[PDB]
Design a protein around this nucleic acid. Structure first.
Ligand SMILES: [Mg+2]
Ligand SMILES: [Mg+2]
Ligand SMILES: [Mg+2]
Ligand SMILES: [Mg+2]
Ligand SMILES: [Mg+2]
Ligand SMILES: [Mg+2]
Ligand SMILES: [Mg+2]
Ligand SMILES: [Mg+2]
Ligand SMILES: [Mg+2]
Ligand SMILES: [Mg+2]
Ligand SMILES: [Mg+2]
Ligand SMILES: [Mg+2]
Ligand SMILES: [Mg+2]
Ligand SMILES: [Mg+2]
Ligand SMILES: [Mg+2]
Ligand SMILES: [Mg+2]
Ligand SMILES: [Mg+2]
Ligand SMILES: [Mg+2]
Ligand SMILES: [Mg+2]
Ligand SMILES: [Mg+2]
Ligand SMILES: [Mg+2]
Ligand SMILES: [Mg+2]
Ligand SMILES: [Mg+2]
Ligand SMILES: [Mg+2]
Ligand SMILES: [Mg+2]
Ligand SMILES: [Mg+2]
Ligand SMILES: [Mg+2]
Ligand SMILES: [Mg+2]
Ligand SMILES: [Mg+2]
Ligand SMILES: [Mg+2]
Ligand SMILES: [Mg+2]
Ligand SMILES: [Mg+2]
Ligand SMILES: [Mg+2]
Ligand SMILES: [Mg+2]
Ligand SMILES: [Mg+2]
Ligand SMILES: [Mg+2]
Ligand SMILES: [Mg+2]
Ligand SMILES: [Mg+2]
Ligand SMILES: [Mg+2]
Ligand SMILES: [Mg+2]
Ligand SMILES: [Mg+2]
Ligand SMILES: [Mg+2]
Ligand SMILES: [Mg+2]
Ligand SMILES: [Mg+2]
Ligand SMILES: [Mg+2]
Ligand SMILES: [Mg+2]
Ligand SMILES: [Mg+2]
Ligand SMILES: [Mg+2]
Ligand SMILES: [Mg+2]
Ligand SMILES: [Mg+2]
Ligand SMILES: [Mg+2]
Ligand SMILES: [Mg+2]
Ligand SMILES: [Mg+2]
Ligand SMILES: [Mg+2]
Ligand SMILES: [Mg+2]
Ligand SMILES: [Mg+2]
Ligand SMILES: [Mg+2]
Ligand SMILES: [Mg+2]
Ligand SMILES: [Mg+2]
Ligand SMILES: [Mg+2]
Ligand SMILES: [Mg+2]
Ligand SMILES: [Mg+2]
Ligand SMILES: [Mg+2]
Ligand SMILES: [Mg+2]
Ligand SMILES: [Mg+2]
Ligand SMILES: [Mg+2]
Ligand SMILES: [Mg+2]
Ligand SMILES: [Mg+2]
Ligand SMILES: [Mg+2]
Ligand SMILES: [Mg+2]
Ligand SMILES: [Mg+2]
Ligand SMILES: [Mg+2]
Ligand SMILES: [Mg+2]
Ligand SMILES: [Mg+2]
Ligand SMILES: [Mg+2]
Ligand SMILES: [Mg+2]
Ligand SMILES: [Mg+2]
Ligand SMILES: [Mg+2]
Ligand SMILES: [Mg+2]
Ligand SMILES: [Mg+2]
Ligand SMILES: [Mg+2]
Ligand SMILES: [Mg+2]
Ligand SMILES: [Mg+2]
Ligand SMILES: [Mg+2]
Ligand SMILES: [Mg+2]
Ligand SMILES: [Mg+2]
Ligand SMILES: [Mg+2]
Ligand SMILES: [Mg+2]
Ligand SMILES: [Mg+2]
Ligand SMILES: [Mg+2]
Ligand SMILES: [Mg+2]
Ligand SMILES: [Mg+2]
Ligand SMILES: [Mg+2]
Ligand SMILES: [Mg+2]
Ligand SMILES: [Mg+2]
Ligand SMILES: [Mg+2]
Ligand SMILES: [Mg+2]
Ligand SMILES: [Mg+2]
Ligand SMILES: [Mg+2]
Ligand SMILES: [Mg+2]
Ligand SMILES: [Mg+2]
Ligand SMILES: [Mg+2]
Ligand SMILES: [Mg+2]
Ligand SMILES: [Mg+2]
Ligand SMILES: [Mg+2]
Ligand SMILES: [Mg+2]
Ligand SMILES: [Mg+2]
Ligand SMILES: [Mg+2]
Ligand SMILES: [Mg+2]
Ligand SMILES: [Mg+2]
Ligand SMILES: [Mg+2]
Ligand SMILES: [Mg+2]
Ligand SMILES: [Mg+2]
Ligand SMILES: [Mg+2]
Ligand SMILES: [Mg+2]
Ligand SMILES: [Mg+2]
Ligand SMILES: [Mg+2]
Ligand SMILES: [Mg+2]
Ligand SMILES: [Mg+2]
Ligand SMILES: [Mg+2]
Ligand SMILES: [Mg+2]
Ligand SMILES: [Mg+2]
Ligand SMILES: [Mg+2]
Ligand SMILES: [Mg+2]
Ligand SMILES: [Mg+2]
Ligand SMILES: [Mg+2]
Ligand SMILES: [Mg+2]
Ligand SMILES: [Mg+2]
Ligand SMILES: [Mg+2]
Ligand SMILES: [Mg+2]
Ligand SMILES: [Mg+2]
Ligand SMILES: [Mg+2]
Ligand SMILES: [Mg+2]
Ligand SMILES: [Mg+2]
Ligand SMILES: [Mg+2]
Ligand SMILES: [Mg+2]
Ligand SMILES: [Mg+2]
Ligand SMILES: [Mg+2]
Ligand SMILES: [Mg+2]
Ligand SMILES: [Mg+2]
Ligand SMILES: [Mg+2]
Ligand SMILES: [Mg+2]
Ligand SMILES: [Mg+2]
Ligand SMILES: [Mg+2]
Ligand SMILES: [Mg+2]
Ligand SMILES: [Mg+2]
Ligand SMILES: [Mg+2]
Ligand SMILES: [Mg+2]
Ligand SMILES: [Mg+2]
Ligand SMILES: [Mg+2]
Ligand SMILES: [Mg+2]
Ligand SMILES: [Mg+2]
Ligand SMILES: [Mg+2]
Ligand SMILES: [Mg+2]
Ligand SMILES: [Mg+2]
Ligand SMILES: [Mg+2]
Ligand SMILES: [Mg+2]
Ligand SMILES: [Mg+2]
Ligand SMILES: [Mg+2]
Ligand SMILES: [Mg+2]
Ligand SMILES: [Mg+2]
Ligand SMILES: [Mg+2]
Ligand SMILES: [Mg+2]
Ligand SMILES: [Mg+2]
Ligand SMILES: [Mg+2]
Ligand SMILES: [Mg+2]
Ligand SMILES: [Mg+2]
Ligand SMILES: [Mg+2]
Ligand SMILES: [Mg+2]
Ligand SMILES: [Mg+2]
Ligand SMILES: [Mg+2]
Ligand SMILES: [Mg+2]
Ligand SMILES: [Mg+2]
Ligand SMILES: [Mg+2]
Ligand SMILES: [Mg+2]
Ligand SMILES: [Mg+2]
Ligand SMILES: [Mg+2]
Ligand SMILES: [Mg+2]
Ligand SMILES: [Mg+2]
Ligand SMILES: [Mg+2]
Ligand SMILES: [Mg+2]
Ligand SMILES: [Mg+2]
Ligand SMILES: [Mg+2]
Ligand SMILES: [Mg+2]
Ligand SMILES: [Mg+2]
Ligand SMILES: [Mg+2]
Ligand SMILES: [Mg+2]
Ligand SMILES: [Mg+2]
Ligand SMILES: [Mg+2]
Ligand SMILES: [Mg+2]
Ligand SMILES: [Mg+2]
Ligand SMILES: [Mg+2]
Ligand SMILES: [Mg+2]
Ligand SMILES: [Mg+2]
Ligand SMILES: [Mg+2]
Ligand SMILES: [Mg+2]
Ligand SMILES: [Mg+2]
Ligand SMILES: [Mg+2]
Ligand SMILES: [Mg+2]
Ligand SMILES: [Mg+2]
Ligand SMILES: [Mg+2]
Ligand SMILES: [Mg+2]
Ligand SMILES: [Mg+2]
Ligand SMILES: [Mg+2]
Ligand SMILES: [Mg+2]
Ligand SMILES: [Mg+2]
Ligand SMILES: [Mg+2]
Ligand SMILES: [Mg+2]
Ligand SMILES: [Mg+2]
Ligand SMILES: [Mg+2]
Ligand SMILES: [Mg+2]
Ligand SMILES: [Mg+2]
Ligand SMILES: [Mg+2]
Ligand SMILES: [Mg+2]
Ligand SMILES: [Mg+2]
Ligand SMILES: [Mg+2]
Ligand SMILES: [Mg+2]
Ligand SMILES: [Mg+2]
Ligand SMILES: [Mg+2]
Ligand SMILES: [Mg+2]
Ligand SMILES: [Mg+2]
Ligand SMILES: [Mg+2]
Ligand SMILES: [Mg+2]
Ligand SMILES: [Mg+2]
Ligand SMILES: [Mg+2]
Ligand SMILES: [Mg+2]
Ligand SMILES: [Mg+2]
Ligand SMILES: [Zn+2]
Lengths: 116, 59, 118, 48, 112
RNA sequence: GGAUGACCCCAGGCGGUAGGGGAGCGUUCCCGAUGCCGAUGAAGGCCGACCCGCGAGGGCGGCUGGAGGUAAGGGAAGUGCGAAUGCCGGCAUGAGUAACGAUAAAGAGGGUGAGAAUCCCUCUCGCCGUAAGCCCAAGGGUUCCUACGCAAUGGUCGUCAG
RNA sequence: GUGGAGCCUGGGAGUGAGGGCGCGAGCGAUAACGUCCGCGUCCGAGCGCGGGAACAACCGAGACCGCCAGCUAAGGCCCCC
RNA sequence: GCUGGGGCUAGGAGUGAAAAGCUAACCGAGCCCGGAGAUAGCUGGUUCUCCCCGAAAUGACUUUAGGGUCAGCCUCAGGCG
RNA sequence: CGUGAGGGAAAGGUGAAAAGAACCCCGGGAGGGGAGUGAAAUAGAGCCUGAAACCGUGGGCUUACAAGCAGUCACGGCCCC
RNA sequence: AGAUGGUAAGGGCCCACGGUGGAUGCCUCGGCACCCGAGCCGAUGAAGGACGUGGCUACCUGCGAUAAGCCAGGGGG
């Protein structure tokens, strides 16, 4: 029996191109160029899936810092105080507190200052 | 010469950008005051044959 | 450059260009009205006007002058005897040019009529 | 310039012609070969 | 109600006719007519016919009034190309593509 | 642990080129098939943000299509392509660009016709004239002459034409 | 010392152009991103991640997948950051 | 001297006032078909997926040095413990 | 294609049935629009299915102080569900 | 003094719908392989052709100036 390509390859190319929707020029229109693009994309996702955790933590730290200097201390000092006080609310919530619940954040600054 | 050549295929975007100046300008026309038909100005009206008020031409 | 130069070249060398105006003159003077391209038309005016002015003179000299371009005694007789008198009082402007409204199909050339005046 | 095909009817027939092919063991093999292939012409067309 | 005409296999190259078509898209049947008449292009001849026939269709088949017709849509499509040989120097042969247009004019009625 | 592959718990390993090994997906075909799915719609095609699978894939749904397809479990191979200045074809880019093939040359009037710079006629102009005229022989093979045509051929047009 | 240790018999290989760096020599000129050996390392194959402005082999560290959680390494904490 | 027509000489052969010129638009050995799928230690190319391990670029010999044979290093199975 | 020996292609499919579209309309014609046939006509002869590159028309979002292997991660605006 | 919007000559992504093109599936008047059967023709002019041959006939097929065919036997309806 002879097993010609037949239907199979077209189906694989369709798979790829559908993933390449939205891409520029031949990157969304040509299987070859699409595939190349998609490799790049895949590694970027992985790498950026990682840096997202970095990208946010850096943001929180910048925000907490700003709210700290409003009460007359810096981020480094603040965090040491919390450590000394045994407060373990993370920087995700610390920032949300720093914006939405400034009184509560103020109290945390008190505790921090006392723990030094 | 040494036979210059396109280095890369021009993209659909770039060839069409080049043609952003390629549209035809419509013919400028005015009514012929005799027969009200539309014709280019400063030409003898090809419908009634009048120009400058008089019959000039057998149409 | 072309600073203050008078005379179209009409994409012809010296002798062809000369021949061109002459043949036009023969045809204008013959049929009273011809159709050409606008540029030849505008350029034909003065060439013919001059010839009509000489006809307005009438002398043997001016006849022999016109013959240099027109070359046809009968055509010139028509020029001197029938044409020139119509212009006895007219001071130049023995010709007019009016542009037609449609171009040639095969090459898109804009057309004009050139006629002798009333 | 003078090119390579310089048509001559006598030259043609005398060189590739049917009788020329038959005179020689090789040419008869030519005819054999072209017939087995089913060629419509065993021999170059010519007019006289 | 709409009326369409199509000229298939017109022996002109699409990129060229389209230029002419672009002039009349969205125009009133009356303006389109005038435009085409004094457009200095080969394409104008072909377009005019498709436009004229579509106008005919509307009046004659679709109960639409001539004095209200306007070019609702118009477009040129590539038809099959006629491939021809163009002999070049040094024994090389090129291939000219004498191209083809499918010209479509679609008329609607400007009401009121 | 339970009874031996059911599943659960605890622990540890799990970057990877040449390469070794394991487990799977899908394609053509055969048994399964005198069967079963099928016009209340086969295969193929086009969508899907839904479901299953680590994945290759498998479903299901809608549109198309209009006559085929074949399960569980096995069998056999022309069995998976992105590259070979690969092969065949199709279509792009360069681009409305270079060019339209001797710089002997053209102009107007009048016909014809749906349509004319290009076909016919007239007049004017130019070129060849030991030729770019005439007559033979090779070679070509109906190209000759009329009528009727303009899709293609004609480097544009075409009413004309080898 | 229970380790993707080790030994024995077989099946399948691939490799037989390495390279940078550190240390010990020869060659060179106490030259070379030089050459040639020795021990080690890394790249090769970790052009995956952090630092070094950027940079295969320098420093930090061996990436099974996910997290808008925490602690560190080298390196940093005036603004870009 | 040039030129038409009719002829003859060819592939390791012709022909050459000699240039290895020419022998049907590439002649230090024509073209076609066959031997033929020559041979090519060279260059290129080698197509689904997941999981585990994971090298070498050294030694010896080699008309050998960009190829090999054996050894070293990788992998799998069984055995030992 | 080659003087020749010799080389040597491409090119299948309307429909069950021609019922292969009378007649009218625009047009020189080609082509199309109605009418008609058919279960079906984007099965209409340039005919089963009709993918892809490629070309175009319409709509949504977007772009004329901006730096790029064209992606990816985040947030926001707009359109749709 | 400050700040923020509607521009699109044209371009980009997405959706729809077409054009071009002829992949895919289905189909087969064709081929392929094995097996079996069968196996020479020609001067009584072969093989293979050329030119002809129809009321109207380009090509193919058939046939040979008795020319898509003439005579006779058999089949068939
Ligand atoms: Mg296959
Ligand atoms: Mg294949
Ligand atoms: Mg896509
Ligand atoms: Mg996008
Ligand atoms: Mg792109
Ligand atoms: Mg990837
Ligand atoms: Mg991650
Ligand atoms: Mg996180
Ligand atoms: Mg982290
Ligand atoms: Mg701490
Ligand atoms: Mg903390
Ligand atoms: Mg608030
Ligand atoms: Mg030069
Ligand atoms: Mg280009
Ligand atoms: Mg490209
Ligand atoms: Mg490009
Ligand atoms: Mg460009
Ligand atoms: Mg575009
Ligand atoms: Mg451009
Ligand atoms: Mg007036
Ligand atoms: Mg000058
Ligand atoms: Mg002046
Ligand atoms: Mg001037
Ligand atoms: Mg002036
Ligand atoms: Mg002058
Ligand atoms: Mg001027
Ligand atoms: Mg010039
Ligand atoms: Mg010039
Ligand atoms: Mg010029
Ligand atoms: Mg000239
Ligand atoms: Mg002169
Ligand atoms: Mg007259
Ligand atoms: Mg003067
Ligand atoms: Mg003079
Ligand atoms: Mg004169
Ligand atoms: Mg004018
Ligand atoms: Mg004008
Ligand atoms: Mg023309
Ligand atoms: Mg000579
Ligand atoms: Mg030739
Ligand atoms: Mg000769
Ligand atoms: Mg002869
Ligand atoms: Mg001879
Ligand atoms: Mg002979
Ligand atoms: Mg014999
Ligand atoms: Mg012979
Ligand atoms: Mg034959
Ligand atoms: Mg022969
Ligand atoms: Mg013969
Ligand atoms: Mg145009
Ligand atoms: Mg456009
Ligand atoms: Mg015009
Ligand atoms: Mg115009
Ligand atoms: Mg009408
Ligand atoms: Mg040329
Ligand atoms: Mg040539
Ligand atoms: Mg090309
Ligand atoms: Mg072309
Ligand atoms: Mg075309
Ligand atoms: Mg685990
Ligand atoms: Mg492991
Ligand atoms: Mg691994
Ligand atoms: Mg294994
Ligand atoms: Mg498959
Ligand atoms: Mg299947
Ligand atoms: Mg049933
Ligand atoms: Mg259905
Ligand atoms: Mg249906
Ligand atoms: Mg199938
Ligand atoms: Mg999926
Ligand atoms: Mg699927
Ligand atoms: Mg489905
Ligand atoms: Mg389906
Ligand atoms: Mg059936
Ligand atoms: Mg199936
Ligand atoms: Mg079985
Ligand atoms: Mg199976
Ligand atoms: Mg096999
Ligand atoms: Mg194969
Ligand atoms: Mg590959
Ligand atoms: Mg390829
Ligand atoms: Mg190339
Ligand atoms: Mg190749
Ligand atoms: Mg190609
Ligand atoms: Mg092109
Ligand atoms: Mg231009
Ligand atoms: Mg250019
Ligand atoms: Mg230019
Ligand atoms: Mg030019
Ligand atoms: Mg020419
Ligand atoms: Mg040329
Ligand atoms: Mg010329
Ligand atoms: Mg010229
Ligand atoms: Mg001269
Ligand atoms: Mg000229
Ligand atoms: Mg006329
Ligand atoms: Mg008339
Ligand atoms: Mg003409
Ligand atoms: Mg014409
Ligand atoms: Mg004329
Ligand atoms: Mg001409
Ligand atoms: Mg001419
Ligand atoms: Mg005259
Ligand atoms: Mg001379
Ligand atoms: Mg003489
Ligand atoms: Mg002479
Ligand atoms: Mg003669
Ligand atoms: Mg003769
Ligand atoms: Mg000939
Ligand atoms: Mg003929
Ligand atoms: Mg007669
Ligand atoms: Mg024609
Ligand atoms: Mg024509
Ligand atoms: Mg025509
Ligand atoms: Mg015809
Ligand atoms: Mg033409
Ligand atoms: Mg030509
Ligand atoms: Mg006619
Ligand atoms: Mg005629
Ligand atoms: Mg003739
Ligand atoms: Mg131990
Ligand atoms: Mg190990
Ligand atoms: Mg080990
Ligand atoms: Mg061992
Ligand atoms: Mg072993
Ligand atoms: Mg093996
Ligand atoms: Mg090796
Ligand atoms: Mg070696
Ligand atoms: Mg080396
Ligand atoms: Mg070495
Ligand atoms: Mg070494
Ligand atoms: Mg070495
Ligand atoms: Mg090493
Ligand atoms: Mg050192
Ligand atoms: Mg040290
Ligand atoms: Mg020293
Ligand atoms: Mg070194
Ligand atoms: Mg050194
Ligand atoms: Mg050294
Ligand atoms: Mg070295
Ligand atoms: Mg070492
Ligand atoms: Mg080392
Ligand atoms: Mg390597
Ligand atoms: Mg490594
Ligand atoms: Mg390592
Ligand atoms: Mg690294
Ligand atoms: Mg790099
Ligand atoms: Mg990096
Ligand atoms: Mg790094
Ligand atoms: Mg770095
Ligand atoms: Mg480096
Ligand atoms: Mg690990
Ligand atoms: Mg780990
Ligand atoms: Mg910390
Ligand atoms: Mg530190
Ligand atoms: Mg410091
Ligand atoms: Mg900072
Ligand atoms: Mg820094
Ligand atoms: Mg002689
Ligand atoms: Mg002779
Ligand atoms: Mg001779
Ligand atoms: Mg001879
Ligand atoms: Mg030889
Ligand atoms: Mg030989
Ligand atoms: Mg010899
Ligand atoms: Mg000699
Ligand atoms: Mg030859
Ligand atoms: Mg030669
Ligand atoms: Mg040789
Ligand atoms: Mg030769
Ligand atoms: Mg042979
Ligand atoms: Mg052999
Ligand atoms: Mg061979
Ligand atoms: Mg070979
Ligand atoms: Mg050998
Ligand atoms: Mg490992
Ligand atoms: Mg070595
Ligand atoms: Mg070694
Ligand atoms: Mg060597
Ligand atoms: Mg070797
Ligand atoms: Mg070996
Ligand atoms: Mg070994
Ligand atoms: Mg070992
Ligand atoms: Mg073992
Ligand atoms: Mg063990
Ligand atoms: Mg030939
Ligand atoms: Mg020939
Ligand atoms: Mg021939
Ligand atoms: Mg077909
Ligand atoms: Mg059927
Ligand atoms: Mg049928
Ligand atoms: Mg009509
Ligand atoms: Mg009519
Ligand atoms: Mg006609
Ligand atoms: Mg019709
Ligand atoms: Mg119709
Ligand atoms: Mg019906
Ligand atoms: Mg019905
Ligand atoms: Mg039904
Ligand atoms: Mg219907
Ligand atoms: Mg229809
Ligand atoms: Mg359909
Ligand atoms: Mg259908
Ligand atoms: Mg069917
Ligand atoms: Mg179709
Ligand atoms: Mg189609
Ligand atoms: Mg399509
Ligand atoms: Mg659009
Ligand atoms: Mg600025
Ligand atoms: Mg802006
Ligand atoms: Mg930008
Ligand atoms: Mg830029
Ligand atoms: Mg960049
Ligand atoms: Mg970005
Ligand atoms: Mg952020
Ligand atoms: Mg302001
Ligand atoms: Mg905007
Ligand atoms: Mg825009
Ligand atoms: Mg626009
Ligand atoms: Mg479509
Ligand atoms: Mg088609
Ligand atoms: Mg099948
Ligand atoms: Mg069969
Ligand atoms: Mg005998
Ligand atoms: Mg016979
Ligand atoms: Mg026959
Ligand atoms: Mg009987
Ligand atoms: Zn008027």
């Amino acid at each position: 029996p002879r097993a010609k390509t037949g239907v199979v390859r077209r189906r694989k190319h369709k798979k790829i191109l559908k993933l390449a929707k939205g891409y520029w020029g031949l990157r969304s229109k040509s299987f070859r160029k699409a595939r190349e693009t998609l490799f790049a994309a895949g590694n970027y996702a992985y790498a950026h899936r990682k840096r997202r955790k970095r990208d946010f933590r850096r943001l929180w730290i910048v925000r907490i810092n700003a709210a700290c200097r409003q009460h007359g201390l810096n981020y480094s000092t603040f965090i040491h105080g919390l450590k000394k006080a045994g407060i373990e609310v993370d920087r995700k919530n610390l920032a949300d507190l720093a914006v939405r619940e400034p009184q509560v954040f103020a109290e945390l600054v008190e505790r921090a200052k006392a723990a030094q | 010469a040494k036979h210059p050549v396109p280095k890369k295929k021009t993209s659909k975007a770039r060839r069409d950008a080049r043609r952003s100046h390629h549209a035809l300008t419509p013919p400028t026309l005015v009514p012929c005051p005799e027969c009200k038909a539309m014709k280019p100005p400063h030409t003898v009206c090809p419908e009634c044959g009048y120009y400058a008020g008089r019959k000039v031409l057998e149409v | 450059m072309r600073h203050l130069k008078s005379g179209r070249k009409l994409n012809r060398h010296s002798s062809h260009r000369l021949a061109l105006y002459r043949n036009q003159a023969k045809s204008l003077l013959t049929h009273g009205r011809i159709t050409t391209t606008v540029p030849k038309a505008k350029e034909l005016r003065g060439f013919v006007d001059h010839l009509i002015h000489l006809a307005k003179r009438g002398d043997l000299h001016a006849r022999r002058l016109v013959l240099r371009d027109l070359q046809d005694v009968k055509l010139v007789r028509k020029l001197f005897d029938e044409i020139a008198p119509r212009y006895r009082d007219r001071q130049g402007g023995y010709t007019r040019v009016l542009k037609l409204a449609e171009r040639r199909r095969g090459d898109g050339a804009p057309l004009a009529l050139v006629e002798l005046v009333e | 310039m003078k090119r390579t095909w310089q048509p001559n009817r006598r030259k043609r027939a005398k060189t590739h012609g049917f009788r020329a092919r038959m005179r020689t063991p090789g040419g008869r093999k030519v005819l054999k070969r072209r017939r087995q292939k089913g060629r419509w012409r065993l021999t170059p067309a010519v007019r006289k | 109600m709409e009326a369409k005409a199509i000229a298939r296999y017109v022996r002109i190259s699409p990129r060229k006719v389209r230029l002419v078509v672009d002039l009349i898209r969205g125009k009133s049947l009356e303006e389109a007519r005038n435009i085409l008449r004094y457009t200095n292009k080969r394409g104008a001849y072909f377009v005019a016919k498709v436009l004229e026939s579509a106008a005919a269709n509307a009046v004659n088949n679709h109960d639409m009034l001539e004095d209200r017709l306007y070019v609702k849509a118009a477009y040129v499509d590539e038809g099959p190309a006629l491939k021809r040989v163009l002999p070049r120097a040094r024994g090389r042969a090129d291939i000219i593509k004498k191209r083809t247009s499918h010209i479509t004019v679609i008329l609607g009625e400007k009401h009121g």
